[PDB]
A paper describes a structure:
Human Epidermal growth factor Receptor 4 (HER4 or ERBB4) carries out essential functions in the development and maintenance of the cardiovascular and nervous systems. HER4 activation is regulated by a diverse group of extracellular ligands including the neuregulin (NRG) family and betacellulin (BTC), which promote HER4 homodimerization or heterodimerization with other HER receptors. Important cardiovascular functions of HER4 are exerted via heterodimerization with its close homolog and orphan receptor, HER2. Here, we report cryo-EM structures of near full-length HER2/HER4 heterodimers and full-length HER4 homodimers bound to NRG1β and BTC.
To test this hypothesis for HER4 complexes, we determined the cryo-EM structures of full-length HER4 homodimers bound to NRG1β or BTC. In both structures, HER4 kinase domains were bound to afatinib to enable high-resolution reconstruction in the ECD module (3.4 Å for NRG1β, and 3.7 Å for BTC). We present here the first cryo-EM reconstructions of both the homodimer and heterodimer complexes of the HER4 receptor in its full-length form, bound to two different high-affinity HER4 cognate growth factors, NRG1β and BTC. This is also the first time that a betacellulin growth factor has been resolved bound to a HER receptor. The HER4/NRG1β and HER4/BTC homodimers adopt overall similar conformations, but our reconstructions show differences in the intermonomer angles that are adopted by NRG1β- vs BTC-bound homodimers. The two receptors in the HER4/NRG1β dimer adopt an angle of 37 degrees compared to 33 degrees for HER4/BTC. Detailed 3D classification analysis revealed substantial scissor-like movements around the dimerization arm in both data sets with the concerted intermonomer movement of domains I and IV, varying from 35 to 39 degrees for HER4/NRG1β and 30–35 degrees for HER4/BTC. In the HER4/NRG1β pocket, HER4 K438, K35, E112 and D376 form salt bridges with NRG1β E215, D219, R207 and R220, respectively. In the HER4/BTC pocket, HER4 D376 also engages an equivalent BTC R103, but the other three residues are substituted with hydrophobic/polar residues in BTC (NRG1β E215=BTC G98, NRG1β D219=BTC A102, NRG1β R207=BTC T90). Thus, substitutions into small, apolar residues in BTC result in a more ‘compressed’ ligand-binding pocket in HER4/BTC homodimers than in HER4/NRG1β homodimers, which may allosterically determine different intermonomer angles via modulation of dimerization arm positioning. Eight of them are resolved in the cryo-EM maps of both HER4/NRG1β and HER4/BTC homodimers that enabled the building of core glycan trees up to 5 sugar moieties (shown for HER4 /NRG1β).
Author numbering:
A (entry chain A): 26 to 179, 182 to 597, 604 to 634
B (entry chain B): 26 to 179, 182 to 595, 604 to 635
C (entry chain D), D (entry chain C): 64 to 111
Write the structure that this text describes.
Amino acid sequence: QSVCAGTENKLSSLSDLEQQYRALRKYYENCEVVMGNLEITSIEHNRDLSFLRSVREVTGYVLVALNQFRYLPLENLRIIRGTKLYEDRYALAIFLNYRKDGNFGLQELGLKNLTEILNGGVYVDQNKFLCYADTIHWQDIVRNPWPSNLTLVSGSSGCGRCHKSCTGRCWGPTENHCQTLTRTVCAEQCDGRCYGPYVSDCCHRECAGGCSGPKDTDCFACMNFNDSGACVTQCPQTFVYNPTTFQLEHNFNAKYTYGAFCVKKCPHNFVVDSSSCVRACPSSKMEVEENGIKMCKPCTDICPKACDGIGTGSLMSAQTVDSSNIDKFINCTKINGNLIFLVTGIHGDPYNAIEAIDPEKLNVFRTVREITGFLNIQSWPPNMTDFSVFSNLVTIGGRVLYSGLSLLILKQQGITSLQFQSLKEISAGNIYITDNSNLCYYHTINWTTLFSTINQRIVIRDNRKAENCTAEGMVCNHLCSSDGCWGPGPDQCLSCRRFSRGRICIESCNLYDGEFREFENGSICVECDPQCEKMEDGLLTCHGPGPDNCTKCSHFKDGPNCVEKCPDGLIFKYADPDRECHPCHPNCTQGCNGPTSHDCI
Amino acid sequence: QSVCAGTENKLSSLSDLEQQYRALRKYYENCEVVMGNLEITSIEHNRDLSFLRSVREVTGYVLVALNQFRYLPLENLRIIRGTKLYEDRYALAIFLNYRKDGNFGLQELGLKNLTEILNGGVYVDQNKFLCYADTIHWQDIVRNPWPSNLTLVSGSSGCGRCHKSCTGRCWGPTENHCQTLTRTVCAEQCDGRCYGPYVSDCCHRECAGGCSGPKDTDCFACMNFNDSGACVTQCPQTFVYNPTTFQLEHNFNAKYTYGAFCVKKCPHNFVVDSSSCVRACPSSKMEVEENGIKMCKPCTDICPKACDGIGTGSLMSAQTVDSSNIDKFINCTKINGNLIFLVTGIHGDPYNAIEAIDPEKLNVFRTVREITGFLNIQSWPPNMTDFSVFSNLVTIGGRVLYSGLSLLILKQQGITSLQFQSLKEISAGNIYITDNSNLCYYHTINWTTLFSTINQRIVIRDNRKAENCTAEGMVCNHLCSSDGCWGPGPDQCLSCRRFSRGRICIESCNLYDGEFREFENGSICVECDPQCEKMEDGLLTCHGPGPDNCTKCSHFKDGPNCVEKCPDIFKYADPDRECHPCHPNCTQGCNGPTSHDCIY
Amino acid sequence: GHFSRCPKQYKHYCIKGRCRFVVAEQTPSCVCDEGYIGARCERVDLFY
Amino acid sequence: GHFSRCPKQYKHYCIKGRCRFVVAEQTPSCVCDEGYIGARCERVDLFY
Ligand SMILES: *[C@@H]1O[C@H](CO)[C@@H](O[C@@H]2O[C@H](CO)[C@@H](O[C@@H]3O[C@H](CO[C@H]4O[C@H](CO)[C@@H](O)[C@H](O)[C@@H]4O)[C@@H](O)[C@H](O[C@H]4O[C@H](CO)[C@@H](O)[C@H](O)[C@@H]4O)[C@@H]3O)[C@H](O)[C@H]2NC(C)=O)[C@H](O)[C@H]1NC(C)=O
Ligand SMILES: *[C@@H]1O[C@H](CO)[C@@H](O[C@@H]2O[C@H](CO)[C@@H](O[C@@H]3O[C@H](CO[C@H]4O[C@H](CO)[C@@H](O)[C@H](O)[C@@H]4O)[C@@H](O)[C@H](O[C@H]4O[C@H](CO)[C@@H](O)[C@H](O)[C@@H]4O)[C@@H]3O)[C@H](O)[C@H]2NC(C)=O)[C@H](O)[C@H]1NC(C)=O
Ligand SMILES: *[C@@H]1O[C@H](CO)[C@@H](O[C@@H]2O[C@H](CO)[C@@H](O[C@@H]3O[C@H](CO[C@H]4O[C@H](CO)[C@@H](O)[C@H](O)[C@@H]4O)[C@@H](O)[C@H](O[C@H]4O[C@H](CO)[C@@H](O)[C@H](O)[C@@H]4O)[C@@H]3O)[C@H](O)[C@H]2NC(C)=O)[C@H](O)[C@H]1NC(C)=O
Ligand SMILES: *[C@@H]1O[C@H](CO)[C@@H](O[C@@H]2O[C@H](CO)[C@@H](O[C@@H]3O[C@H](CO[C@H]4O[C@H](CO)[C@@H](O)[C@H](O)[C@@H]4O)[C@@H](O)[C@H](O[C@H]4O[C@H](CO)[C@@H](O)[C@H](O)[C@@H]4O)[C@@H]3O)[C@H](O)[C@H]2NC(C)=O)[C@H](O)[C@H]1NC(C)=O
Ligand SMILES: *[C@@H]1O[C@H](CO)[C@@H](O[C@@H]2O[C@H](CO)[C@@H](O[C@@H]3O[C@H](CO[C@H]4O[C@H](CO)[C@@H](O)[C@H](O)[C@@H]4O)[C@@H](O)[C@H](O[C@H]4O[C@H](CO)[C@@H](O)[C@H](O)[C@@H]4O)[C@@H]3O)[C@H](O)[C@H]2NC(C)=O)[C@H](O)[C@H]1NC(C)=O
Ligand SMILES: *[C@@H]1O[C@H](CO)[C@@H](O[C@@H]2O[C@H](CO)[C@@H](O[C@@H]3O[C@H](CO[C@H]4O[C@H](CO)[C@@H](O)[C@H](O)[C@@H]4O)[C@@H](O)[C@H](O[C@H]4O[C@H](CO)[C@@H](O)[C@H](O)[C@@H]4O)[C@@H]3O)[C@H](O)[C@H]2NC(C)=O)[C@H](O)[C@H]1NC(C)=O
Ligand SMILES: *[C@@H]1O[C@H](CO)[C@@H](O[C@@H]2O[C@H](CO)[C@@H](O[C@@H]3O[C@H](CO[C@H]4O[C@H](CO)[C@@H](O)[C@H](O)[C@@H]4O)[C@@H](O)[C@H](O[C@H]4O[C@H](CO)[C@@H](O)[C@H](O)[C@@H]4O)[C@@H]3O)[C@H](O)[C@H]2NC(C)=O)[C@H](O)[C@H]1NC(C)=O
Ligand SMILES: *[C@@H]1O[C@H](CO)[C@@H](O[C@@H]2O[C@H](CO)[C@@H](O[C@@H]3O[C@H](CO)[C@@H](O)[C@H](O)[C@@H]3O)[C@H](O)[C@H]2NC(C)=O)[C@H](O)[C@H]1NC(C)=O
Ligand SMILES: *[C@@H]1O[C@H](CO)[C@@H](O[C@@H]2O[C@H](CO)[C@@H](O[C@@H]3O[C@H](CO)[C@@H](O)[C@H](O)[C@@H]3O)[C@H](O)[C@H]2NC(C)=O)[C@H](O)[C@H]1NC(C)=O
Ligand SMILES: *[C@@H]1O[C@H](CO)[C@@H](O[C@@H]2O[C@H](CO)[C@@H](O[C@@H]3O[C@H](CO)[C@@H](O)[C@H](O)[C@@H]3O)[C@H](O)[C@H]2NC(C)=O)[C@H](O)[C@H]1NC(C)=O
Ligand SMILES: *[C@@H]1O[C@H](CO)[C@@H](O[C@@H]2O[C@H](CO)[C@@H](O[C@@H]3O[C@H](CO)[C@@H](O)[C@H](O)[C@@H]3O)[C@H](O)[C@H]2NC(C)=O)[C@H](O)[C@H]1NC(C)=O
Ligand SMILES: *[C@@H]1O[C@H](CO)[C@@H](O[C@@H]2O[C@H](CO)[C@@H](O)[C@H](O)[C@H]2NC(C)=O)[C@H](O)[C@H]1NC(C)=O
Ligand SMILES: *[C@@H]1O[C@H](CO)[C@@H](O)[C@H](O)[C@H]1NC(C)=O
Ligand SMILES: *[C@@H]1O[C@H](CO)[C@@H](O)[C@H](O)[C@H]1NC(C)=O
């Protein structure tokens, strides 16, 4: 089933009517269910809108305004769910669709078998050239049809007479395009909607918009959930209550609830909880992996601190991080949802009186290792030439994407380098980096080391030329490998040859030289136990961990270990002139000098 | 509704037909839902059965066998649920209800409202006076009507047809007494049952009986849960899944599932889990109490020793603790369900080759602290005079009851005292203690103090006379308060007037006398730190636990407390063993606060 | 009547009662002693 | 047309675009600068 996301422009538009039409094609061409609004605005008198005929269901509102075309080809739209309303009031709003000086405008609405609106008002007004719209009995389509509640039907004259084959309430001037009543003609014994005037014509309680027959498998739209070809109030769960034993018992046909559907397994980016697939687990429980499945259970007395992201939880209404909400991130290591920086967040918002962010507040994000949604940077303070405030970020979770993108940077002129250090995974979605006219080191990056599947892509265009950056000496440390680098620092390369010492890449390790001694393997070097005496002039001191694996210790030798005093603790022991411990008679805890009690002090 | 438990006797009976009739009145009189089987056996032809007219629902099977009476007055019986079946096959078994040398037996079935049998077969066989039942069509009533199910009627001279308006299918000679078909006459558009032949006459799908209309709130009976008058497959839970946010969100309409009903509150003795009220949790979760409510959470690396009782879990098939299952209780501390001790469990059962319990084996119960169901003792080895094997038991839960009882002790002549020590609460149900003709501590116990609601009672019909027990000196230790005592020992008292040293009641504490010393607390005395000086003549030197609480000790006195030795910052001590800091540069010895006071 | 002597494999079927065999159904019926109830007469009666 | 100049309380309503006031609905809308979308033109257009 083909699904598209829609728009949130209301009555705003692009600077050219040809670009406004091309955008409408790019958002709504070749799809049937909309996961948002349908917004058709400012379209000219002569355009091909036949691509909109595939739409069958709209999740948000349908807005049709300020256009000039004669016919609205919404020929398969059956149901509007109204999960978001125009002005928080209307699910369908059609207005001002005519040219003021001229004679163009919308004459016929189309709307072939629109039968259900599950929420909100209906507003049809100011549409100068419509013929039939004011004859339509909208109370059959709308639930809670009470006309005083947001049902503001207006708007024209000199037309609206029906064809002899339709008894009033016409959509158009012919034998077809007649409104069919689905609720107001049903028996007083009837539940919901019917396909005829009799009680035997009534359809199942979980169908919407009318039906082909009485069954939950045989109807024009579901409401609540679509259980694999049947409409239902809820899907079968992991456990059921046995009323004769008073306990919960495991089910045989359990399904996980997922969006408007039910599935046998949750997708790999969702968390399993109480027979449902959720985008985030509640803060009372820890997210864990068991047998490759993500799920969550109550946490221990001290557990990770996770913040709400932009567009989720306590920040559901936020569009960006700004000077009012940025203080919420002070000790978070994880962010649930998105992290977004728009021009209204960084440089303030004079309409709403929101202040600009002080560049020093942005150091608050240096504690975050994981973001579960996407990272979206469209503005950044002019004096911050890199992203070092995010250097500790490890993973971009990608559980939600911005138009398919999980890492998104556009138009940052005041940047020279990126300087991420801990970043190793970009788990889902595409990377989109454009218009960064002063950015250099980006061109070196081996992005297949960060991608989690071969299905991921990156888009790069109109950034600073790599040839100009090379000419200026914009290059990383000589140890840096073919994987590339985030910035000029010896600790800012994706991978390096020889050895590293924490984040910093190094040419050699302290095995036989310098202030301390260590041992090396697999491009890593770490100190051996400080009991081992430092060897000089090229002689190796240590070749493994502990007080073991070295040439000798300055302490007293005792098997694989050494001690400060040979008789300490302990069996009892004494030491020889080379500080090696040997057995002594028991007790003697004041001190011993040889193998027997006669050698005790 | 009026709810009563059913009997499970099958074809077995009492030795006296007057007691058989009186027992039948006491179980089934003035109740409409039978929470078990309805079994009517061996009743005489002269008896009044009009009290059975209150029965509307049976959760198990109905058995009518070997009886003499003419008419079975179950006219308003509607549904049989078939939870258990007779011989594991039948939900309704009616057979042999006549005397073959004489002329008495069952003639007319009543049963007019019987509409749904949800599970099992139907068995009508070898009656003599019952003539009408051959006409009835059971496949409308039986939920599983197909030839693979045992639905059968076996003979008499006949009784014509009931009335001209009845097209066969009838119980007795009137237009009032012919069968309402509810399934076989329904329109093919409808699932389940109907109240007429038309699609407009069909019932709501989630109903089992007849209906007044196609509604979940307007049908006579149903096979699923009762959500405040509506019959439903599931009822509203604590959270609802939001299909546009992909999150679980709180539900202000939520109800708990409890048995066959949806309720707002779960009773105090049940544990709440996943929007339901249940008897016990899975072995991976622990019961906890938060805000006065018991609920379950996943357990950590140490989990309680939850243990299967009789009638649940791995022992669901068991009737008693016995020699084949007693080993399952060895390291158990909390038992889910019941402990039941019958004659077969103690003295053996040769019919199944199960040997008697060796009395010593009963010590596996010494570790039990809580029983979540009931305790039922009807047999005990003759060699034991008490129940001291249960002395560690703290609580009886009462989540399941034996005919309303949670503690039941019948006919134990070997017992002279009970000897519980730890038992403090009986959370639900009544107490029934009788026929213990040698037991002398039943009347001294303040039994109301063990109850957790005003609705609990104790019944004691007969035990040893209180005047005879007094004459023998069968009284508790002098320290014991008016709340009474489990046996003769000072430690078996429910509560003592003077302080207790743990479980042992004493006249006075070792505050300032004896070889060890104690401090007072509200009804107990507890030992002080061993460093503290054991002073004479009323000089108590401690006021609670710890070396800091002592007024004078034989060891070193540091800042916060008395210690056996002071640290090597390094400290020195004066001639009164009072400790003070040394110069920081000390390792081997010290006698003062400055560098020249340090010793090597 | 309807009853006969119990077959050998039912010798210990009844506990505190007398065994009878119901011939038409090839099944035992146990008659309980004073104050006893249950399919095999194994439980004490709470009413008496 | 169907709109006039924005009222003073909307002076800063639109960002990187020109504000217009729809008189019949008493509601501001904005015509965005090249490459910008959203109700106040505050977001960059990925399809540009
Ligand atoms: C207005 O409302 C109508 C309903 O009143 C909506 O109609 C839907 O239209 C689509 C097509 O656009 C229908 O889908 C097709 O249905 C055919 C039905 O065939 C007969 O059999 C069924 C059996 O149940 C009868 O109900 C029906 O009356 C017919 O007698 C199928 O034959 C089609 O499948 C075949 O063709 C395709 C071609 O690609 C092949 O892929 C298939 O393998 C197969 O060979 C197809 O399924 C849909 O059924 C209609 N729905 C309803 C509710 O009836 C309109 O969408 C709506 N708008 C407009 C503009 O009319
Ligand atoms: C309850 O949920 C189920 C899914 O569980 C929904 O099922 C959808 O059913 C509709 C039809 O009612 C499908 O839509 C159309 O299907 C035609 C047949 O092809 C499909 O089926 C074959 C196997 O039989 C598959 O191999 C194939 O991939 C398809 O899935 C297509 O011909 C139609 O596509 C054509 O028209 C559209 C424009 O309308 C063009 O964009 C296409 O390019 C093409 O020309 C169309 O796909 C739909 O696909 C089903 N979905 C799923 C997931 O299977 C029920 O509809 C739903 N019920 C309710 C009431 O909500
Ligand atoms: C983000 O999380 C960090 C921790 O990871 C929080 O930082 C801690 O905040 C607490 C707040 O109480 C600090 O505790 C207080 O510290 C004061 C300074 O202590 C430092 O300096 C002395 C110098 O001798 C050192 O000994 C000490 O180890 C510290 O390095 C103390 O003066 C305070 O004592 C007073 O208050 C307590 C209150 O209980 C009284 O009991 C005392 O008697 C006394 O009156 C107090 O101990 C803690 O130091 C901070 N830790 C760090 C690492 O900085 C952030 O607050 C948190 N941010 C948010 C917004 O949640
Ligand atoms: C000084 O430096 C040396 C390295 O130079 C370190 O040596 C390591 O010592 C550890 C033990 O402390 C070794 O680990 C153990 O190895 C056992 C032998 O199997 C390995 O070697 C054979 C050689 O033929 C290989 O075939 C085989 O594949 C293995 O590589 C294993 O039996 C041990 O695991 C089993 O036992 C433990 C018991 O607790 C169980 O927990 C396990 O589940 C398992 O059943 C274990 O793996 C290690 O191999 C040594 N490394 C090397 C390179 O030799 C010293 O540790 C270091 N000094 C100090 C103080 O640490
Ligand atoms: C076999 O099965 C049938 C069908 O289920 C049972 O029918 C029930 O009959 C009784 C007695 O008539 C009904 O109980 C009474 O209902 C009155 C309400 O009116 C009913 O009838 C009209 C049509 O005449 C319907 O429109 C309406 O919906 C009702 O169904 C109440 O007012 C009565 O209450 C008064 O009397 C009682 C007497 O005890 C007092 O306690 C009250 O205080 C009050 O004064 C009474 O409730 C019952 O509703 C019928 N059920 C149905 C579903 O029809 C048969 O009873 C059953 N067979 C036997 C032998 O019982
Ligand atoms: C879902 O759950 C509800 C309850 O949780 C069930 O409804 C109950 O049904 C029982 C049985 O009919 C009712 O019990 C009766 O209580 C009467 C009290 O009077 C009030 O309630 C009745 C409603 O029946 C009103 O008519 C009356 O005006 C009062 O408001 C007693 O008077 C009754 O005793 C008499 O009738 C019984 C019938 O069983 C006779 O045996 C007695 O001899 C006596 O004459 C009776 O005990 C109970 O009140 C109902 N509760 C309510 C009102 O909700 C639903 O049936 C259940 N749904 C299903 C079927 O799943
Ligand atoms: C010998 O040892 C005994 C103990 O066996 C010592 O007795 C002390 O007795 C005093 C009272 O006389 C105790 O003080 C009170 O404790 C209450 C409980 O506090 C604990 O529990 C809560 C549980 O949530 C914790 O939050 C809390 O941290 C403690 O762990 C408090 O509620 C009381 O506070 C009230 O009173 C004070 C009075 O000054 C007010 O300031 C407060 O605002 C409030 O109104 C109070 O603190 C004390 O705890 C006992 N100590 C011990 C060790 O248990 C003897 O003192 C000791 N003798 C010698 C010689 O050392
Ligand atoms: C970017 O990083 C990726 C991932 O580490 C590098 O891809 C790797 O490319 C090498 C060379 O082609 C592959 O090794 C070769 O594989 C073939 C397989 O048939 C084998 O015959 C050769 O002997 C050799 O082993 C390697 O598999 C491949 N890794 C993955 C995961 O695809 C890539 O080189 C990096 N690019 C740069 C320039 O940094
Ligand atoms: C010398 O080589 C060893 C490895 O042979 C290096 O140390 C060890 O590296 C392994 C991975 O190669 C680590 O194992 C991983 O540990 C994490 C712990 O959370 C676990 O999630 C992974 O599944 C995996 O088991 C191991 O922890 C690590 N050990 C230590 C002590 O760091 C070592 O760094 C090399 N260099 C030197 C100089 O020691
Ligand atoms: C047996 O146990 C019961 C239940 O714990 C005890 O009954 C309790 O009697 C006390 C007597 O003081 C009641 O307290 C109060 O008594 C004063 C008397 O002036 C009265 O004014 C107050 O209204 C209040 O009743 C207490 O409430 C009562 N508890 C119950 C549940 O009834 C009884 O004392 C124990 N021992 C004996 C010897 O029966
Ligand atoms: C003096 O006697 C009183 C009783 O009169 C003792 O009070 C008891 O203190 C214990 C301390 O553990 C309380 O236990 C509670 O256990 C739960 C277990 O989950 C825990 O969550 C609580 O924090 C608490 O520790 C107990 O409730 C309390 N009993 C009463 C009746 O208040 C006290 O300990 C005695 N003091 C000495 C010095 O012996
Ligand atoms: C408790 O068990 C003991 C056996 O362990 C019983 O004592 C036996 O009693 C018989 C009576 O005829 C004597 O012949 C035996 O010599 C006794 N044995 C021992 C070891 O003393 C005692 O009767 C049992 N008590 C009860 C009440 O059953
Ligand atoms: C590259 O440098 C040349 C001069 O060598 C200059 O003409 C050109 O504009 C530079 N390009 C960029 C992208 O800076
Ligand atoms: C009470 O004791 C007397 C002897 O003093 C005895 O005759 C009588 O049977 C005893 N009664 C009981 C109940 O044991």
